[PDB]
Design a protein around this ligand. Structure first.
Ligand SMILES: Nc1nc2c(ncn2[C@H]2C[C@H](O)[C@@H](COP(=O)(O)NP(=O)(O)OP(=O)(O)O)O2)c(=O)[nH]1
Ligand SMILES: [Mg+2]
Ligand SMILES: [Mg+2]
Ligand code: NA
Length: 429
DNA sequence: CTTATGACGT
DNA sequence: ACGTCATA
């Protein structure tokens, strides 16, 4: 009805880099450019574990979580770059730094929420209103949207760019005619700005990215993945019913795990759109008040989670798995690795303080023990009063030492399969 | 045979 | 404070 909210109050973008770590490595080594390429961690065991894959390499079926030795079977010519290894562990510093390059460019256009090392949300609502005033009812040319897809169009040509343009033309013709709503116009100007943002990013870093533009974070994120790489996608409120009608529930953010599986199992459905049939109370009874409320609105393309003004990460941490045989079975060994972890952390904390005028005040220590399915066996915290690796490693050991079942002080049992140090609770410096 | 992040429940 | 989930 007239009083019914449609969740069209905001313009939100999600900008996500294509094959991020690969591009960073490609920029540094031109030999890797425009080639089937992947980035791995370590190399001894099975060639190393792949965590990023160029789109050339993806065409051969290489994916994330694949051992490099196995990827080579699919793609014999696969080029590999290795994550920096420091103090016996993976060091992601280059990418965190590359991340900052991108975040800083994005932050010139609008307030951003860093969502991961390679992506951020953008609230473009104010920016759109400002650009709209500047444009005096002056129509929007397709030249202003050279990489934009309008999801759901065309409707009513053989090549992809041909279909992109026709859908875009159909969309633009419906704004200029007055067939579309003002939210639609707002989304379009938002997409214009994102084109500019993405141009600035590539010019100034050499990195390409994709983007989604919509009315909320979830639709923005979903939209971004629709036309990767090097393209942006506008998902309108109107496109939602068709989009969601065959959209598997697991594809929506936060529903890719257990909750999503329970939604599918309990309700006996498969697609996001099928959720509209249930009342809010019904959804609440099965999945709780909060989730139920979120699911009722989300299946209608409505989501209110704000873009938090947070450009920097809330936490600074590092970890290392010691699986199977490599599990840490002595006290001396556990302490040595706590020191390696603490040294990297201290290095990152020190730079963080100089860069961002803040200090962590709490240190979180997490371990995993052999034979435990759970990712984390035990979590403990202590005060973080000094940026000193020796103290931090020593304190971390103090808070976890009790775990040691072994009767001998010299040996550690059950052996440790993971160590994790996280600096948290920042305050102004 | 990974290394991170953020959010939420109790 | 601690554990769990979700992301990738
Ligand atoms: N250490 C570690 N780094 C990872 C892992 N998974 C991903 N990364 C790193 C490597 C990734 O480059 C980066 C960004 O994550 P995505 O955006 O999910 N993948 P990409 O940007 O590669 O491709 P596209 O977005 O176009 O699909 O984070 C992991 O399990 N562990
Ligand atoms: Mg990416
Ligand atoms: Mg990403
Ligand atoms: Na090359």
């Amino acid at each position: 009805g007239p009083h019914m909210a449609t969740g069209q109050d905001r313009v939100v973008a999600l900008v996500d880099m294509d094959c991020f770590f690969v591009q960073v490595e490609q920029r540094q080594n031109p030999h890797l450019r425009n080639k089937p390429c992947a980035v791995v961690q370590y190399k001894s065991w099975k060639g190393g574990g792949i965590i990023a894959v160029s789109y050339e390499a993806r065409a051969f079926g290489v994916t994330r979580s694949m051992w490099a030795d196995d990827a080579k079977k699919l793609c014999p010519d696969l080029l590999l770059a290795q994550v920096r290894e420091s103090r016996g562990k993976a060091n992601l510093t280059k990418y965190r730094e590359a991340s900052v390059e991108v975040m800083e460019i994005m932050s010139r256009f609008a307030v951003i929420e860093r969502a991961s090392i390679d992506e951020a949300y953008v609230d473009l609502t104010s920016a759109v209103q400002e650009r709209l005033q500047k444009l005096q009812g002056q129509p929007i040319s397709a030249d202003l949207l050279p990489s934009t897809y309008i999801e759901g169009l065309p409707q009513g040509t053989v090549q992809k760019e041909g279909m992109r343009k026709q859908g875009l033309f159909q969309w633009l013709d419906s704004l200029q005619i007055d067939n579309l709503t003002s939210p639609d116009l707002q989304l379009t100007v938002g997409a214009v700005i994102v084109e500019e943002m993405r141009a600035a990013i590539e010019r100034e870093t050499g990195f390409q990215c994709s983007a989604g533009i919509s009315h909320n974070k979830v639709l923005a994120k979903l939209a971004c993945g629709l036309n990767k790489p090097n393209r942006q996608t506008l998902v309108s409120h109107g496109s939602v019913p068709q989009l969601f009608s065959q959209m598997p529930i697991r594809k929506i953010r936060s529903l890719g795990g257990k909750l999503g599986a329970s939604v599918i199992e309990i309700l006996g459905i498969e697609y996001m759109g099928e959720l509209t049939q249930f009342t809010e109370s019904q959804l609440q009874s099965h999945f709780g008040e909060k989730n139920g409320s979120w699911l009722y609105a989300m299946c209608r393309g409505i989501e209110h989670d704000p873009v938090k003004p947070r450009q920097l990460p809330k936490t600074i941490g590092c970890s290392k798995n010691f699986p199977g045989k490599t599990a840490l079975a002595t006290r001396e060994q556990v302490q040595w690795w706590l020191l390696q972890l603490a040294q990297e952390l201290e290095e990152r904390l020190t730079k963080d303080r100089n860069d961002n005028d803040r200090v962590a005040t709490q240190l979180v220590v997490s371990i995993r023990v052999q034979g435990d399915k759970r990712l984390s066996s035990l979590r403990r915290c202590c005060a973080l009063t000094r940026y000193d690796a020796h103290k931090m490693s020593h304190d971390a050991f103090t808070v976890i030492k009790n775990c040691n079942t072994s009767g001998i002080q010299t040996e550690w049992s059950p052996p440790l399969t993971m160590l994790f140090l996280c600096a948290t609770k920042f305050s102004a410096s």
